[PDB]
Write a protein that binds this ligand. Structure first.
Ligand SMILES: c1ccc2c(c1)[nH]c1ccccc12
Ligand SMILES: c1ccc2c(c1)[nH]c1ccccc12
Ligand code: FES
Ligand code: FES
Ligand code: FES
Ligand code: FES
Ligand code: FES
Ligand code: FES
Ligand SMILES: [Fe+2]
Ligand SMILES: [Fe+2]
Ligand SMILES: [Fe+2]
Lengths: 104, 387, 388, 387, 104, 114
């Protein structure tokens, strides 16, 4: 169920934050403007950390091979990525960032 | 994509065909005979520029791309099938299921996050008439009937054949086979004399342009092809003259063959009847890479019982195969190879000077351009790209 | 610019490495063994795409570019050393000094204004441990130690080896060598049984990414490299399973080898200990051109005198060379060749699908990209170009 | 252009020459000896990248491009000369006249509209001194004398020679031949000792730049060439030294040869006298394709009667051919091959470091750039293109 | 010696009209602005129908290989064409277009 | 010979032009006029046998007509490949509106330190 990630102001616009989860695969929380999104942190094309990539609009570019994903739908935006990223809806209440426990 | 855009721009009637040097994607293609692949003995081959692996498990055929997802090596360099349903890469042991290509295990790291999250490309494979067909395409395949000439799949049709690799682009092969006037190169074939065939040197066209061919845009199964009707209103040429003097004659045999000749997508010719009044020939020109193709020949004959089939198989091995498939078609092989240089730089597609009988070829190029199911690109081979 | 810029732009973490198809300039590289080059007997070789000539005069080695300054022919087509300190092109007789490459004479025209005004490219050369190293770079060379792995130069370390030309780009060779999981290809090596080795099939990593390796850039001699510490927190794989069933096991020998593996610029691997608990293996993957490399293998074992040295040599010839250098590493050769097609069009650098053990390789790619001393280009081979 | 514009922009004195990788069009070129082509036996060859066919009919030579207008196959794959004056393509039987290349008949369709309306490329052919010259150009050809060195066509000059294919661009051959200092590579030639020749190792230039050569652009025959006059004011080098010490000596034979050397468009050298004081050598470096050329060698010696011709022919076979053409010129062959890599990427034309004696080569490059009759391009080979 | 083509008004400038002739090769009638021109319909480089090509000014481009001809002179304008096209006499009278039976 | 060689009147040279100065028993020099200043170097390109006076002067950089190499006329240093060997530079002075070029090239002798 929902996990408290951080205060909205803890992230500058256009930045990415990695969220480690004990016993689980890490997640990546993106701040596009004033909006927040989250996906699995590991690129589906390899072992790269998307949180160490480049964000352009709502598209995250993997730092390894240039593959890319739409941080909202999790669908590939650029090759060689073909496997859709797991998306996690995020909630922002009272200046606090929350990311769902499961996908969807 | 595959050809200089300045050239494609000039070819308004069939640019896609000229662009299709690697062949048409999303079509079925015969690549070998059933007897060539046995239980648990994977076989390699290249189709449309792609390296593939075919295996037979519990009687059924499966096809996997022969390129490991990890570092791109061909799995076939050192085959390792450690369980009946899988194949393990010899390099870092990534293991894939023949069934769906899913990466089910990694012996070097059983806890890898990649397990169950990657999939090696697979292609549908179907056996029919003793022939192995592979659907080199994406998504659910259409019926095999769509990509085969009429009657090839008939219940009582007995199919026997031969396959080999020829050094020429597949299109040169298709055009040579469907070329009404190329019959000239067969004037001295042993089959003509030894099987007493009637064979003109060519044809003096008759009637209008549209009467020269019959395009089939749709069949009951979605077939797309063209029939050569040059002999419908045309005059068979039996004596060749130069300056009014006879310098060559056609063959005045009694057997009338090649009543109808038709070419069908993705590139298979049907000559009926041939090489004997009671048989028919179906041959594919399968793209292997830009410079080579499989010349997959088959001869069919209706057979009711097992006795006739036996007899037919005997006749095939002792007469038809050596006298027709080789004695007749061997000249087509070097004729195809002779056109390689002119088209190799793609300039031949602009500089060729066509004459009347070529209406058949033009009809094929247009039909192919309008009804093919996709152009294979080098990107399909190395990995699709889109930024 | 050796690779399509579109591809390089995609590889944010190690573009320089992907661009270094011809290797890194300004580094020392071993190209042959001392005993292979005799007095006044010029030897030809290609290094980083450059044709070179090496010669021994009064015991000392000299290296000249094997390409006359005049019409660009290789002097080696017809070698002409008319004096001990020079070589004369067989074409128009331009004559150069081995010591500095200066065009000192021209037999076809002694009054030529070019005499003394032109200089053929020369490269520093030094022999160490019976190996011939050539500094393929410009300006005064750095200490050899910078481009050699630790202990290779130790006083007592006796070095023996073998060298050959392999048909694959040098980087594929480097990565195959420093690859923790490729060990799987060696499961049936005669060395494993014949030398009672303990050898797993692979490794299940443990701990974080940073812990997977140790990046060295604080070495006092200046060497730059990476240590593979996968077996530090990872569970070695001895039982290979498919669907949970054991289909293959590793080797349960008594000898413990390869406790630590490290790769160092310009591209030399160190496996310690190997192939025996009291030995070390040092191997270079020297760039010859874009498609080939020298697989320079050396095995080191401390020796206190000429008696032990002689003993070791005999063991090397009858056992180590055939059983290890060949019996073990022969599989690495065809493995390297098998990756050629995928990477030949430079597309493999984008389409490869990596997994956990490749973290070590990634670290190497980044270290190499950041600490290499220069990227060799085709222009270096034909002649550097520049417009005012 | 056949070369990167960035390179041509850099070579302001002879860019056309650097661009002429395939040779100069609109010039006569020798390709074989008359005795090598018999009546009614077509011979194939490639000249300036073009595949050609030469045939002798009633003693006269004719030249047709060896590429059918229809599908671009070489007619020579299977030669079919059905009447004395024509050749019929083996594929669809398009038939051409040797004399004008006109498409006069088509056996596969005698009613075709293409008949009498298409023409295959023909090239002028002329035999002289027992040598076969082909005018690889368009329009009525100029006199053969324009493209031959002085005295070659002299009535009493008996011409004997040899021809072969060498693996190097024609220009590298030309420059090797006209190179005053390359003489060094011949210092150990058997001709030097066996024919007691006087042969220096090089030359110490003397006088101004203009005096180093004699550019010919006022020849009444139209010949365009350059004479090498380095020995007129320079001091012959017979003692080569290093550090002031003599390390090699030239040849001090009694026979004086090669005191007159000249290079002429399209690319033929004349060495006089050579290999003997009473003879002359004329050699062509004929472009076949960008990587190869015919090394057409000929030796000339005046002969007033058959007895003298026979005598000459005898010594040619026994001495001149084996001792000179081969014994002396063989080193030129691998010398040419040795320069291929440096110029292969066209960068050698920029990075070469020339010295004094190369002034003669520079004169030739400028002469060739200014007086060639055309730059052959790949487009000439495939088919001229223009919008 | 004249065949009725059509009414000048039935052809927009820059358009082509194929004129089939019984027992004879077809012709192509081009309308360049206010003047009409005619030539053989069949391209001299092959068997293409020029009436199915593109008219740019007074130059007709063949649909097969991009070869071209000047519709007024019948001379080749673009490669690979090299053989001159047969030109026929065109005549407009009473608003109707007429083409000559034989070429000039 | 002579320490200073008389070339021509400073007014006989237009800005951006080059003049070749032949010397008995020695290699030729090239004098360049950059604006109102005069410079001089060996005339022969160090990359071959070309005459730089037959090249093109662009500002203070002379381009060789043979292979496109170039040099800075003030320092004699290479400015464009394939040239790599520096040109000898000769001091030029104007006395009485007359141009004079040195007979010996300048050396890294008794001048500013590095
Ligand atoms: C891991 C474990 C052993 C080795 C290795 C990586 N790379 C190697 C290269 C040569 C010999 C042994 C090894
Ligand atoms: C100088 C001296 C002799 C020769 C030459 C240049 N060029 C030649 C070409 C063929 C045979 C001899 C020579
Ligand atoms: S690991 Fe992300 S694009 Fe390859
Ligand atoms: S390349 Fe196949 S598992 Fe590594
Ligand atoms: S190529 Fe070496 S001296 Fe001329
Ligand atoms: S290719 Fe020659 S007649 Fe068809
Ligand atoms: S058929 Fe018209 S350009 Fe070829
Ligand atoms: S001679 Fe001046 S650039 Fe080469
Ligand atoms: Fe055929
Ligand atoms: Fe290995
Ligand atoms: Fe020579």
């Amino acid at each position: 169920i929902w996990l408290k990630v951080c205060a909205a102001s803890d992230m500058q616009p256009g930045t990415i934050r990695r969220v480690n989860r004990v016993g689980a695969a890490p997640l990546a929380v993106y701040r596009v403007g004033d909006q927040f999104y989250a996906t699995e942190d590991t690129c589906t094309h390899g072992i790269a950390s998307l949180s160490e990539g480049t964000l352009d609009g709502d598209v995250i570019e993997c730092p390894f091979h240039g593959g890319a994903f739409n941080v909202c739908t999790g669908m590939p935006a650029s090759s060689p990525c073909t496997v859709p990223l797991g998306v996690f809806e995020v909630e922002v209440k009272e200046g606090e960032v929350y990311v769902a426990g499961e996908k969807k | 994509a595959n050809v200089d855009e300045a050239i494609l721009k000039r070819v308004k009637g069939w640019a896609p065909y000229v662009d299709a040097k690697l062949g048409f994607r999303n079509h079925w293609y015969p690549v070998m005979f059933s007897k060539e692949i046995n239980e648990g003995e994977p076989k390699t081959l290249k189709l449309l520029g792609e390296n593939l692996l075919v295996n037979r498990i519990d009687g059924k055929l499966y096809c996997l791309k022969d390129r490991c997802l990890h570092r791109g090596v061909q799995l076939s360099v050192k085959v390792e099938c450690k369980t009946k349903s899988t194949i393990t890469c010899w390099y870092h042991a990534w293991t894939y299921r023949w069934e769906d290509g899913v990466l089910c295990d990694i012996l070097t790291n059983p806890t890898s996050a990649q397990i169950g999250r990657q999939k090696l490309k697979t292609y549908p494979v179907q056996e029919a008439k003793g022939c192995v067909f592979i659907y080199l395409g994406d998504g659910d395949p259409p019926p095999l009937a769509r990509d085969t000439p009429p009657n090839f799949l008939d219940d009582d049709m007995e199919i026997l054949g031969k396959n080999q690799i020829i050094k020429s682009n597949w299109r040169l092969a298709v055009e040579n086979g469907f070329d009404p006037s190329h019959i000239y190169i067969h004037k001295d074939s042993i089959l003509v004399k030894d099987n007493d065939l009637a064979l003109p040197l060519g044809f003096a066209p008759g009637g209008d342009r549209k009467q020269q061919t019959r395009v089939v845009d749709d069949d009951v199964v979605g077939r797309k092809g063209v029939y050569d009707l040059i002999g419908e209103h045309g005059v068979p040429v039996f004596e060749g003259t130069i300056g009014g003097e006879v310098v060559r004659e056609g063959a005045y045999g009694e057997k009338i063959v090649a009543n109808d000749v038709s070419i069908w997508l993705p590139g298979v010719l049907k000559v009926n009847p041939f090489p004997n009044p009671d048989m028919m020939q179906f041959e594919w020109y399968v793209p292997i890479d830009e410079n080579t193709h499989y010349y997959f020949q088959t001869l069919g004959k209706p057979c009711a019982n097992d006795e006739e089939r036996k007899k037919y198989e005997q006749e095939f091995e002792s007469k038809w195969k050596p006298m027709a498939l080789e004695g007749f078609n061997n000249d087509d092989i070097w004729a195809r190879e002779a056109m390689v240089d002119f088209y190799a730089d793609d300039k031949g597609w602009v500089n060729e000077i066509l004459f009347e009988s070529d209406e058949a070829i033009v009809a094929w190029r247009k039909l192919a351009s309008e009804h093919n199911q996709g152009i294979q690109t080098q990107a399909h081979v190395s990995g699709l790209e889109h930024h």
